[PDB]
Design a protein around this ligand. Structure first.
Ligand SMILES: [Cl-]
Ligand SMILES: [Cl-]
Ligand SMILES: [Cl-]
Ligand SMILES: [Cl-]
Ligand SMILES: [Cl-]
Ligand SMILES: [Cl-]
Ligand SMILES: [Cl-]
Ligand code: NA
Length: 129
């Protein structure tokens, strides 16, 4: 599924991400824009053989099982395929574990490089939330 901007803002708020760990909804929407372009089916292979999945590009090195990332963990206790669903529940629940891990949203390198410190409220501007 390719979400619209305000459609994703609303879905993220419905699943309790808005102000989760102090990160406003615009931070989450911005991260999703630059990780996946709002596409739930986004995948990207890393040089180390791990794979990033879904709207928030969650990595198989730590967070999900794809059976093809040696030595990896599955800390969200999910198949990485669950992160590609039209329903964002698995991606949100896993993202809440990641952002609680100690480095906040810096876990998402695209958020650090393209969202952090910017006017992220622009990402929810106009949205009926
Ligand atoms: Cl957009
Ligand atoms: Cl915001
Ligand atoms: Cl594996
Ligand atoms: Cl594990
Ligand atoms: Cl699995
Ligand atoms: Cl959803
Ligand atoms: Cl933080
Ligand atoms: Na894994």
């Amino acid at each position: 599924k390719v979400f619209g901007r305000c459609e994703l803002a609303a879905a993220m708020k419905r699943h309790g991400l808005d102000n989760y760990r102090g990160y406003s909804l615009g931070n989450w929407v911005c991260a999703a824009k630059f990780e996946s372009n709002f596409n739930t089916q986004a995948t990207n292979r890393n040089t180390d053989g791990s794979t990033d999945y879904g709207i928030l590009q969650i990595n198989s090195r730590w967070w999900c099982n794809d059976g093809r990332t040696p030595g990896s963990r599955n800390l969200c206790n999910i198949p990485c395929s669950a992160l590609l669903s039209s329903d964002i529940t698995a991606s949100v629940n896993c993202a809440k574990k990641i952002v609680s891990d100690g480095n906040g949203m810096n876990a998402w390198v695209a958020w650090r490089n393209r969202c952090k410190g910017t006017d992220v409220q622009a990402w929810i501007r106009g949205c009926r939330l």
